[PDB]
Amino acid sequence: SFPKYEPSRLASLPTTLDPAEYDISSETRKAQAERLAIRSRLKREYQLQYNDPSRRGVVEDPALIRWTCARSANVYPNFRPNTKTSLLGALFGIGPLIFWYYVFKTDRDRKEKLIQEGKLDRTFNISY
């Protein structure tokens, strides 16, 4: 009695029913052990830089600085203009702009033609 739990990009696949967790290779055991080793070494270095009574300033997290310089300044290299990048650039940059420009031309031509005929509700339209 189960609808098999299809996932999505927003409904994440939970840690219970993977079901790849229940047929296990030994290399995955080695991987989990070495991943625990990495987190243990990082917490050891952090806690030794964390409890010094002589230390005053911030701890200078290198991953945060690395992510920030990855996100701000290191986008422009690397870059090459591809067909995908040029297509998506001219789509998201010019397309909606020329769309709203067409609709403003349409609305303004209708409004000026209509007041050239004069059949608007400007019986009193003072604060223009």
CB of 60 or CB of 83, closer to another protein: 60
Residues that bind another protein (CB under 8 A): 1-3, 5, 14, 16-17, 19, 22, 29, 32-33, 35-37, 39-41, 43-44, 47-48, 50-53, 55-59, 61, 64, 68, 71-73, 96-97, 100-101, 103-105, 107-108, 111, 127-128
> Shortest distance, CB of residue 44 to another protein, whole angstroms?
5
Helix (H, G, I), strand (E, B) or coil at 78: coil
| Smallest separation, CB 119 to another protein (Å) | 16
Residue placing its CB nearer to another protein in the complex, 10 or 73: 73
Q: 45 or 85: whose CB is closer to another protein?
A: 45
For residues 55 and 46, the answer to whether their CB atoms sit within 8 Å is no
Q: Are 122 and 115 in contact (CB under 8 A)?
A: yes
Note the Cα 27 to chain centre separation in Å. 33
> Two tokens at 121?
């509700």
Tally of CA atoms within 13 A in the half-sphere of 87 that contains its CB: 3
CB of 69 to another protein, least distance (A): 10
Which tokens is 92 given? 């998201």
Angle at 62 between CA 29 and CA 28, to 5 degrees: 10
Closer to another protein by CB, 10 or 33: give it: 33
In the complex, what is the shortest distance from the CB of residue 90 to another protein, in angstroms, rounded to a whole number?
A: 14
Q: What is the CA radius of gyration of the chain?
A: 30
